[PDB]
Design a protein around this nucleic acid. Structure first.
Ligand SMILES: Cn1c2ccccc2c2c1cc(C#N)c(=O)n2-c1ccc([N+](=O)[O-])cc1
Ligand SMILES: OC[C@H]1O[C@@](CO)(O[C@H]2O[C@H](CO)[C@@H](O)[C@H](O)[C@H]2O)[C@@H](O)[C@@H]1O
Ligand SMILES: [N+]
Lengths: 415, 553
DNA sequence: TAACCCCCCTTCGGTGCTTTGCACCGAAGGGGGGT
């Protein structure tokens, strides 16, 4: 007996028509069981080929989770769905969440399965479950409630969400709560033991509404410990021609980011035509330039700030030896953040797992810091990424990505 | 008393009306035989006559069944297809015998007149209108509309295919011990039951279909192996493809090779070692399908070696979920790779090849990674899991590659199999400058207008060279400069360039290239013992970079 | 003188950075196969 919030697509845009990709045996069996229970419970209903829309579906296991979870790649639907900020159902972002000492991520998407969905919009949530060796043609479904992973689900459910949290928020006025997709971010400055305690409070507080993949899981972050990776110039007591060439090249690249960098006095050291391994001492003018460039690299870039109306972009470089650097920006060469990851799962044996981990780490940081997920530029061949990335995905959202191939001429972000 | 199949709602594209195309001139031979079928479908209930109030029409004609005295009737709904709503096909792939588990009892049957046993949408039958000339359009003629799914309509396959699934759904849930491969109207039924209970199970299903109006003619009911299914032959313990027809025509046109290479690809799924590199190379060029092509020596040898593979009959086995999947790859040369998938040695589930040349410059390691990826996706489709790989590359070679490459790459669990030719890296670039090695500052430039250019170098020992070049580009002169430094240096050399283009190619350790010049550079690199490439920014007054830039510009 | 589906080989034009050249890649259009 709950009326459905009407939802439209952006005018002049069709629905999602994305082909389902092949799934492993274990992923299909988990899907059949999940979709069987969801159909019994009325959350999904079978459809026919007269529905021209489709969205990929697969399954994941979250970190240290042994039970399957269903994930729908609603990226195409989310881009074609009307932006709810224009409908004024947009969720603001608290700039203090990134300042808390601890932040726990709660999967609250399960609560979305109680709110009905606009009947005229249900045909856009269609998905197809494949079968091994194409024994059976595709089994198609569609959603009758708010589907997990859809950008409209947290917006429509926001009104109900603020009600359920009102008691907890007013009893704990210092704890910040942010909602993004199927997840809830709860940050506090309290002691770790007291933080986990207040988290369990909100858990059973959530049952007091569910009583009237599951809620139980929670992952702890620490955004106050997140650091940046600055551009670094090596310190040497003797320099070879090759060292100064590398330095001049690196500084020349860096000048696009820091406009005050100059390389005139250092280039003159390379006037002749010398062997690369020849040791040449610095001139007095070159020593000041090197020190002055380091200072400019110590201070932040001028006039670089976050524009809420612009999309976030993330670039990643494979530095070797389990090292991975990344930069987040909206305008080229105006970086909002630069970082480096090392010793992630799969280090020294699996590049795709490390990159998948890095993509998830960077997305989580962008959500906490700006409430946006960035579009990724991935250092990998398209077919290679597409063949393996689902085997290691452990998040309930999926960011946008594209594929780049940039040979490292200058070691800019990592020595 | 048959059960009526619920109709599927079908619409036209928004803002579009039905098709109005009228008729093409028809020969009397076809006009005659058609009117006989029109009455048969009206009596049988497949078609209705009333069409004076219908402004739409779609042409109709007929041709002969393949090498049969019977005429095959078909409607050209290409205009209606443009105006019909888009459908999402539920047919996602083709089943493969290598994915079938061994079943004690097997049956293969088809549904008689599939499209004509499915009721078309009530409101949509009006748009399927069509007109036949009575006698060369002398008289107006008999008009009809379809009451069922017609052949040639873009929505018929998906609608029938999905309706078939809803009908089979209750039977499968009430008989989980049975396996049914449904491909269009073709059905594969297998079980470990006794042949008696099997034929009982078959008749339960065979009646289950008739209740919804689906006949199962005994003309298409197969009870005894070998079963003809999806273009294969199904034996109790082995499968094989239906025989392949190799064209032996001694005069080859363009279209002759297209049909020839096409059948070889189809054969490569069980016949190991099939190669189509040299034959397909004949096909490269915007030449018409009628042009006759003389077979080169290699293309003629490749075809001969294929005959040697196809002259002997090969069989495949069935899948055993209890055993692991094994995939083994061999290098065939010229960027050709063949593989076999099996669970026990020499009893292949299937075979295949990967010969795609992606990128102007690459190496065997990249191509091997791509072959592994093709096999991986293919295995997830047929068996839903990734096989264990046996690769002709040493662990040391692979580690050096993926750890040093700037792009993320990976191969699933695998082991080395010593089966030459082995995959290796043909050269490796130093990470630090080589002490005591001559340093070549190379550079090149080309006049944009005359296409003329220069390439050369200057070294720390005073060695210099400048070479004039005709019909070239800036990028080519940059590669030429590097080539000159490799030609004119000892076994160890430092090379400094500002060509991002050249470094990007060479740093990826290519062993093969579409560029004659790049291949010559590779030939030089393989001969060297140590090579250190370093990049510097141009126009910054650096070392011999500014000096050599003057010489060549 | 055609409907839908999977595959491979080729060409080609659109895209972006390696720049107004060159390379990557998806869409076709050829062919094989299935109903
Ligand atoms: C060469 N060919 C064929 C060759 C073999 C079998 C079918 C077709 C075929 C065709 C061609 C068309 C068309 N258009 C077509 O509709 N069919 C078709 C397929 C299935 C059914 N049915 O299941 O009832 C009816 C028509
Ligand atoms: O979307 C088409 C197709 O391209 C891929 C390649 O990785 O990436 C896209 O996937 C999304 C749909 O699932 C797109 O909306 C998005 O723009 C893009 O990342 C595949 O994921 C996808 O199948
Ligand atoms: N140059």
């Amino acid at each position: 007996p709950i009326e459905t919030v009407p939802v439209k697509l952006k005018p002049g845009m069709d629905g999602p028509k994305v082909k389902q990709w092949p799934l492993t045996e274990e992923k299909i069996k988990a899907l059949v069981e999940i979709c069987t229970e969801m159909e019994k419970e009325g959350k999904i209903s079978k459809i026919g080929p007269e529905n021209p829309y489709n969205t990929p579906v697969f399954a994941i296991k979250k970190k240290d989770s042994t039970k399957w979870r269903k994930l729908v790649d609603f990226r195409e639907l989310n881009k074609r769905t009307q932006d709810f900020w224009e409908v004024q159902l947009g969720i603001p972002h608290p700039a203090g969440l990134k300042k808390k000492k601890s932040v726990t991520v709660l999967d609250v998407g399960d609560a979305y399965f109680s709110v009905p969905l606009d009947e005229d919009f249900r045909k856009y949530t269609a998905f197809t479950i494949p079968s091994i060796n194409n024994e059976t043609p595709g089994i198609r479904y569609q959603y009758n409630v708010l589907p997990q992973g859809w950008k409209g689900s947290p917006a429509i459910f926001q009104s109900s969400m603020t009600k359920i949290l009102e008691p907890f928020k007013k009893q704990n006025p210092d704890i910040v709560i942010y909602q993004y997709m199927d997840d809830l971010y709860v940050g506090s400055d309290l002691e770790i033991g007291q933080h986990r305690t207040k988290i369990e409070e909100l858990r059973q507080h959530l049952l007091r509404w569910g009583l009237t993949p599951f809620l139980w899981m929670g992952y702890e972050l620490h955004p106050d410990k997140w650091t940046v990776q600055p551009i670094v110039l090596p310190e040497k007591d003797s320099w070879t021609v090759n060292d100064i060439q590398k330095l001049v090249g690196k500084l020349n690249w860096a000048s696009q980011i820091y406009p005050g960098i100059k390389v005139r006095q250092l280039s003159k050291l390379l006037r002749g035509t010398k062997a690369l391994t020849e040791v040449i001492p610095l001139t007095e003018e070159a020593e000041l330039e090197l020190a002055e460039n380091r200072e400019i690299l110590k201070e932040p870039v001028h006039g670089v700030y976050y524009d809420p109306s612009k999309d976030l972009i993330a670039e990643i470089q494979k530095q070797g030896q389990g090292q991975w650097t990344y930069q987040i920006y909206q305008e080229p060469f105006k970086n909002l953040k630069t970082g480096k990851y090392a010793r992630m799962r799969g280090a020294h044996t699996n590049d795709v797992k490390q990159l998948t981990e890095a993509v998830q780490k960077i997305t989580t940081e962008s959500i906490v810091i700006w409430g946006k997920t960035p579009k990724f530029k991935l250092p990998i061949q398209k077919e290679t990424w597409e063949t393996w990335w689902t085997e290691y995905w452990q998040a309930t959202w999926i960011p946008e990505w594209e594929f780049v191939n940039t040979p490292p001429l200058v070691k800019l972000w990592y020595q | 008393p048959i059960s009526p199949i619920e109709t599927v709602p079908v619409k036209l594209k928004p803002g579009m009306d039905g098709p109005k195309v009228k008729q093409w001139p028809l020969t009397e031979e076809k006009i005659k035989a058609l009117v006989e079928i029109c009455t048969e479908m009206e009596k049988e209930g497949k078609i209705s006559k009333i069409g004076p109030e219908n402004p739409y029409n779609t042409p109709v004609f007929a041709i002969k069944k393949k090498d049969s005295t019977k005429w095959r009737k078909l409607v050209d709904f290409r205009e209606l297809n443009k105006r019909t709503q888009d459908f999402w096909e539920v047919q996602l792939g083709i089943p493969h015998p290598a994915g079938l588990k061994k079943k004690k009892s097997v049956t293969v049957l088809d549904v008689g007149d599939a499209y004509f046993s499915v009721p078309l949408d009530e409101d949509f039958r009006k748009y399927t209108a069509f007109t036949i000339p009575s006698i060369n359009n002398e008289t107006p003629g008999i008009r009809y509309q379809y009451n069922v799914l017609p052949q040639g309509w873009k929505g018929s396959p998906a609608i029938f295919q999905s309706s078939m699934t809803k009908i089979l759904e209750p039977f499968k849930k009430q008989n989980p011990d049975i396996v049914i491969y449904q491909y269009m109207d073709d059905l594969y039924v297998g079980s470990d039951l006794e042949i008696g209970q099997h034929r009982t199970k078959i008749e339960e299903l065979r009646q289950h279909l008739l209740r919804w109006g689906l006949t199962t003619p005994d003309k298409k009911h197969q009870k005894e192996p070998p079963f003809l299914w999806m273009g294969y032959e199904l034996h109790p313990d082995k499968w094989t493809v239906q025989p392949i027809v190799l064209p032996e025509k001694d005069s080859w046109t363009v279209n002759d090779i297209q049909k020839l290479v096409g059948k070889l690809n189809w054969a490569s799924q069980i016949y190991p070692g099939i190669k189509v590199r040299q034959l397909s190379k004949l096909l490269r060029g915007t030449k018409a399908l009628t042009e006759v092509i003389p077979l080169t020596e290699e293309a003629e040898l490749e075809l001969a070696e294929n005959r040697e593979i196809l002259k002997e009959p090969v069989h495949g086995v069935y899948y055993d979920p209890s055993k692991d999947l094994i995939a083994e790859i061999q290098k065939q040369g010229q960027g050709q790779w063949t593989y076999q998938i099996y669970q026990e040695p020499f009893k292949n589930l299937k075979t295949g090849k990967y010969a795609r040349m992606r990128g102007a410059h690459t190496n065997d390691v990249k191509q091997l990674t791509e072959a592994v990826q093709k096999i991986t996706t293919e295995s997830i489709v047929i068996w839903g899991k990734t096989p264990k790989f046996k690769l002709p590359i040493q662990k040391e070679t692979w580690e050096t590659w993926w750890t040093e490459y700037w792009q993320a790459t990976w191969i699933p669990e695998w082991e080395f199999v010593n089966t030459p030719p082995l995959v290796k890296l043909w050269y490796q670039l130093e990470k630090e400058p080589i002490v005591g090695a001559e340093t070549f500052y190379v550079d090149g430039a080309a006049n944009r207008e005359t296409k003329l250019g220069k390439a050369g170098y200057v070294t720390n020992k005073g060695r210099q060279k400048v070479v004039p070049l005709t019909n070239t580009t800036n990028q080519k002169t940059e590669l030429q400069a590097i080539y000159l430094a490799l030609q004119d240096s000892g076994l160890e050399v430092n090379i400094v360039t500002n060509s991002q283009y050249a470094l990007g190619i060479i740093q990826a350790q290519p062993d093969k290239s579409e560029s004659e010049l790049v291949n010559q550079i590779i030939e030089q690199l393989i001969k060297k013992e140590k090579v250190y490439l370093a990049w510097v920014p141009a126009h910054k007054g650096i070392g011999g970079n500014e000096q050599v830039d003057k010489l060549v510009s």
